[PDB]
Write a protein that binds this ligand. Structure first.
Ligand code: HEM
Ligand code: HEM
Ligand code: HEM
Ligand SMILES: [Fe+2]
Ligand SMILES: [Fe+2]
Ligand SMILES: [Fe+2]
Ligand SMILES: [Fe+2]
Ligand SMILES: [Fe+2]
Ligand SMILES: [Fe+2]
Lengths: 159, 157, 158, 158, 157, 157
């Protein structure tokens, strides 16, 4: 029982998205943490653990197909300065992952595995359920205005 | 005992208001749910369930009068895009109900049954307790301003 | 992402089945309770709310596809007088559900969305459990006889 | 210490009755479950596991006599469609077991083992305790009539 | 609504795998029960009930398709003497199941049922989650050695 | 108050060791997880999370110095096949971190900050409490021999 290496690569190209998404959420989480924009920092910190949960079940599956996880390669990572830029860039990153997950399942359905597609749809169902929130968030600032939007995301701590 | 048919349609035209008001509340409750306006979405879900409670006690009464509920015919339903139009539209819907309910009871009390008028006033007492609320709500946006009014209706959760 | 309207209308014609099924279940639930037929009216009221919430998970899907729910148009609704007629009627109503749902998902799997079809099977799996039950119930009346079948559906509770 | 192969086979001929009886009870338990005949399906599922508890202690016993359990051969299994003949069919299956077990224990007492026939009587006290019950059941249908007898075993589900 | 017989037989040949695997797991569990290798027999008894859980949901499906379960005929069942042979033979039995499951779901997906394939994948997901553990165990012995592998399976209790 | 840039890369070259260390632990932890080498797999998962506790306060330090964390580039990561190779490889990785931590604090004390060096010693106390343990582990195999050493790592559960 050996996985077809393209299907393995179809798993593997998903994996490079995982490691980059860990750091770009977490540093931005640590970015706003100094910036005091408090409740949104609580969101992306709790969000980042789900991709840790997303990546681990990915990691087991290729071992069931007797694969070799490359944790060495990486994609390019970006940073922003205001949150709109932070909300615009990762959208493309979330726009990046879907089509790869889209194009993977149609071909892997043609090649007789069922179980790895069940992994692939499940993570794909998360991100479409994820990206809309950002799409909800951005204009909700943008129609309203950033300053009053900034005026509600902060609070003084409990010393 | 047989229900008088004139009273029966007076119950019935109220029922047509009920089913239409269910959907126009609920979809607009689901509309702001996507639009992140969290707290009023909790409120509009709470308003919809009372009309669901309003309709069932309406429903059994005509069966006591041995009637046939038309759950088939409806009235025209509208939608809005900002909240103010939604607050303007349902006002007319609330303006639609009361005067017709005002029309029914006097004619009903003229014809010797008491019991459905008790249902009439009880359902009237809610909407007169309801129509003023949005009437207070809309000017409170309008005097103040919509953008800051939007600045308190959301929640990141 | 914008939903393809052929998927959207196929979501939409499911919705028209949903609203009509609410009223025909509930009124017939409000039929037999006056008729004393108690536990099936408990069952029919219990049958309503699952079919209710089936439409809500239908509803929230199409706004992700940026759609406009027609909560205005309906299908034709029927009533009966004895329960056998009701059990014959809703069978056809459930007979209308599956094949159209069967007609959809093949095309939906043919057109590069997966996520909506998971709802499509999920609403299907319920009515698989539903249509046989009423199919079971009718022969129980028919092999036995209606009168003794009425002789177990009523209690002294009012 | 080695078991005498006749006694082993006489233990073994019980075992063929065991696995056959498990399926013929369980499918009928699943049959009336689809047929809605509720409490008998509760009773048939409950009666089946005692036979599962029956067969396992037989399986250890031949290992104590250092035997080889044939889990391969099976006797012929039947099925019906009405409820009555199922009570007639298993009666013969109940009639099949006892006399052969009656044939054994005399020979078991004839040949200097005590312990295996203790299992034989322990299972035989069960098989008498079944055959009377179904015999009590069937005439109670038969004197009364099937339809009113059927008119008490179905009840609604949750 | 009637089940298609080619779908039905595909359920049916799966069923023959069930009853054979029940006895071969259970007796070999009862084999090491004499042989004092208790913790794997604890593993074997708990594993055997899950196939009994797999078999009943197989059974109720076909009567929804209005089918007739053949609980009558079976396939050939084997026995071993050391555990490696027991680990080698059931692997083939697990190798027997999955391709037949692979052969079924491709065809019935072309033939307009969805629901029984959901049953088929669910048991198929178990066996691929099963057969690796067999494959994990057997190489772990022969790399290490059998006698020390025997040196960890008794309990004296 | 601005961080002196020489301090910043000396924080940063520690950081490049950090992200590489998590994966080489975890994948090898996931390697033995398939291999049934479970009790040390429990240990290696515990080793991963402490490094996350080490790396975060490192990241919190540099923003006080107004720094830019390069989470982008890495160092070279290796894999092994038997545990001795794994215990030999990470030893060098443990040997890699200390001298950089050693060469830091002499300069960190030399240039009028204490607080970053307080982090620098606090991380350094961990690996000296760590590299001895793995050094103890490998020789404990080495006198003994791998097979009997492996013969206690299996749980069968
Ligand atoms: C101060 C707290 C934490 C920090 C700074 C942190 C940070 C990180 C980072 C940077 C990664 C990516 C490294 C990698 O993927 O190998 C990661 C992965 C992970 N962490 Fe955390 N984490 C924290 C809390 C936790 C806790 C408390 C747990 C478990 C009880 C946990 C479980 C995991 C898991 C399962 C992964 C995925 C492993 C992997 O994909 O390689 N994390 N964490
Ligand atoms: C003709 C009468 C009614 C109609 C048309 C109606 C309609 C609905 C609808 C559309 C939903 C959304 C479910 C979904 O999206 O899946 C719902 C939910 C619900 N229904 Fe009704 N309803 C009616 C009467 C009632 C009444 C009077 C009650 C209870 C006293 C009730 C019990 C419920 C409850 C409790 C929920 C909320 C379930 C939840 O929050 O999880 N229904 N109903
Ligand atoms: C929730 C509890 C149980 C379930 C779902 C279950 C399931 C089943 C079913 C349905 C069968 C019949 C299949 C057939 O023979 O065609 C079976 C066979 C069997 N049952 Fe169970 N059973 C349960 C309890 C038990 C227990 C607790 C034991 C033993 C301690 C047991 C012992 C057996 C044996 C040994 C067989 C195989 C018969 C043979 O090899 O001849 N059962 N199992
Ligand atoms: Fe993901
Ligand atoms: Fe009302
Ligand atoms: Fe439904
Ligand atoms: Fe027995
Ligand atoms: Fe299975
Ligand atoms: Fe560290």
């Amino acid at each position: 029982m050996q996985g077809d290496p393209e299907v393995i690569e179809f798993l593997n190209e998903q994996l490079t998205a995982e490691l980059t998404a860990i750091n770009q959420y977490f540093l931005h989480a640590k970015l706003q943490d100094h910036k005091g924009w408090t409740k949104l920092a609580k969101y992306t910190r709790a969000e980042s653990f789900d991709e840790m949960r997303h990546a681990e079940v990915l990691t087991d599956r290729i071992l069931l197909l007797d694969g070799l996880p490359n944790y060495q390669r990486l994609f390019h990572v970006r940073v922003g300065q205001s949150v709109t830029e932070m909300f615009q860039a990762d959208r493309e990153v979330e726009l990046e992952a879907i089509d790869r997950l889209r194009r993977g399942i149609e071909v892997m359905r043609a090649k007789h595995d069922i179980t790895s597609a069940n992994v692939f749809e499940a993570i794909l169902a998360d991100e479409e359920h994820h990206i809309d929130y950002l799409e909800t968030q951005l204009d909700l600032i943008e129609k309203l205005g950033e300053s009053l939007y900034l005026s509600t995301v902060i609070e003084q701590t409990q010393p």
